[PDB]
Structure formats: C-alpha cells, structure tokens
Design an enzyme around this catalytic site. Structure first.
Site, mmCIF file in Angstrom:
data_model
loop_
_atom_site.group_PDB
_atom_site.id
_atom_site.type_symbol
_atom_site.label_atom_id
_atom_site.label_comp_id
_atom_site.label_asym_id
_atom_site.label_seq_id
_atom_site.Cartn_x
_atom_site.Cartn_y
_atom_site.Cartn_z
ATOM 1 N NE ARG A 54 13.294 -13.446 -2.924
ATOM 2 C CZ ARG A 54 13.962 -12.590 -3.699
ATOM 3 N NH1 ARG A 54 13.993 -11.297 -3.398
ATOM 4 N NH2 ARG A 54 14.588 -13.021 -4.788
ATOM 5 C CG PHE A 59 20.591 -13.819 -3.647
ATOM 6 C CD1 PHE A 59 21.271 -12.678 -4.057
ATOM 7 C CD2 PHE A 59 19.289 -14.006 -4.082
ATOM 8 C CE1 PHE A 59 20.661 -11.742 -4.891
ATOM 9 C CE2 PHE A 59 18.672 -13.082 -4.915
ATOM 10 C CZ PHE A 59 19.359 -11.945 -5.319
ATOM 11 C CD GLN A 62 13.188 -8.953 -0.657
ATOM 12 O OE1 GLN A 62 13.821 -9.710 -1.387
ATOM 13 N NE2 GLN A 62 12.074 -8.330 -1.058
ATOM 14 C CG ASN A 101 13.367 -2.521 -7.482
ATOM 15 O OD1 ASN A 101 13.050 -3.428 -8.255
ATOM 16 N ND2 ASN A 101 14.524 -1.882 -7.575
ATOM 17 C CG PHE A 112 18.508 -6.852 -1.013
ATOM 18 C CD1 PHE A 112 17.718 -5.964 -1.731
ATOM 19 C CD2 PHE A 112 19.742 -7.219 -1.538
ATOM 20 C CE1 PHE A 112 18.158 -5.422 -2.935
ATOM 21 C CE2 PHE A 112 20.200 -6.671 -2.739
ATOM 22 C CZ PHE A 112 19.398 -5.774 -3.441
ATOM 23 C CG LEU A 121 20.882 -7.505 -7.780
ATOM 24 C CD1 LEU A 121 20.531 -7.744 -6.318
ATOM 25 C CD2 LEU A 121 19.685 -7.800 -8.690
ATOM 26 C CG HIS A 125 17.639 -3.957 -6.774
ATOM 27 N ND1 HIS A 125 16.448 -4.164 -6.111
ATOM 28 C CD2 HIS A 125 17.636 -4.810 -7.824
ATOM 29 C CE1 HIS A 125 15.773 -5.126 -6.714
ATOM 30 N NE2 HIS A 125 16.469 -5.531 -7.757
#
Ligand code: NA
Length: 164
Positions: A54, A59, A62, A101, A112, A121, A125
C-alpha cells in the site's frame, strides 16, 4: 543503543536501492526490537521477501504484511499483536517510521514510512524510527503508488538486516 537496519527494495525485480532506518530503542524498545528482529529474521520469519502493498503518493509507503501480503496480516515477534508502547515520538515529516495498525493495541509487523508530515496520526500510531539514508529510494517506491494505495509495480523487500 539505537539499531541501524536496512531494507533493500526492488520493483518488478529491478533494484531500487537501500533504505537505512534508525530504530528508537531509547524511546520504544519493545517496538524497535520487533522491527529489528523482523529485519534480521532471527526468529525464523520476517520482512525478507515481502512487499510494500500500500503506497500512497504524498502520504506514505506501507509494508510488513509478510503473511497475507495485502494489509490484513503480519505478526510480531511477541505474538500476533502487541500494545501501543507509547506515543512519545511524533509524525513530524517525511522519513518518519511508524507502526500501521487496526486500532488501539493492534501492532503486528506492518509499518509505514511517511513521505509527508502525517501529524494527524499522532497518538494513534506508534512512531519508532526514521530514515537515516535512502529517502530517494523511498521516493522511488512512492512513485509506484496511487491515491488508492494500489501499486503499479510489485515492490519487494529483497533483503534486510542490521548494520549496527
Ligand atoms: Na488525502
């Protein structure tokens, strides 16, 4: 005390280069040690041969689902999941290394690398390191993503390990 580990990454079998990560064992020793050991494979399993499944431009990238290779899997060296250690480190910009998560206390192996500041985040995270060298390699990875997260090439961690 902070480990330096590396990821060697290719796209469709073509090497992209090496990402070197510092793991903040001084702030999150449990989280750092999970990632460290999954890089060395010393528990008999780990990141070697798994994918960045991903990747979202502007951004993050991942990876770490070495069981299902799609974001639903992975496991930690402690068991399937382990608690959020703390949220001391923040998502301050590109290069931050943070645990993916599925909500509170669901850390497994997925992680990531940010390519922007992902401050929203914070507190959700667990940040546990950052890119020391190879942010250009991260940007190469990022170039094979999409806003959906789906990658246009198969991005594989061909090798990984510990440098110090
Ligand atoms: Na967005």
């Amino acid at each position: 005390a902070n480990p330096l580990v590396y990821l060697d990454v290719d796209a469709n079998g073509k090497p992209l280069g090496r990402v070197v990560l510092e793991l903040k064992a001084d702030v999150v020793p449990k989280t750092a040690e999970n990632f460290r050991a999954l890089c060395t494979g010393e528990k008999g399993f780990g990141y070697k041969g798994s994918t960045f499944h991903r990747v979202i431009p502007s951004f993050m990238c991942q990876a770490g689902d070495f069981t299902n290779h799609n974001g639903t899997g992975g496991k930690s060296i402690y068991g399937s999941r382990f608690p959020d250690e703390n949220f001391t480190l923040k998502h301050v910009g590109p290069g931050v290394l943070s645990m993916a998560n599925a909500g509170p206390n669901t850390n497994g192996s997925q992680f990531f690398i940010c390519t922007i500041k992902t401050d929203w985040l914070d507190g959700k995270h667990v940040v546990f390191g950052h890119v020391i060298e190879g942010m250009d390699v991260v940007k190469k990875i990022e170039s094979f993503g999409s806003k959906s997260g789906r990658t246009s090439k198969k991005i594989v961690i061909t090798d990984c390990g510990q440098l110090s």
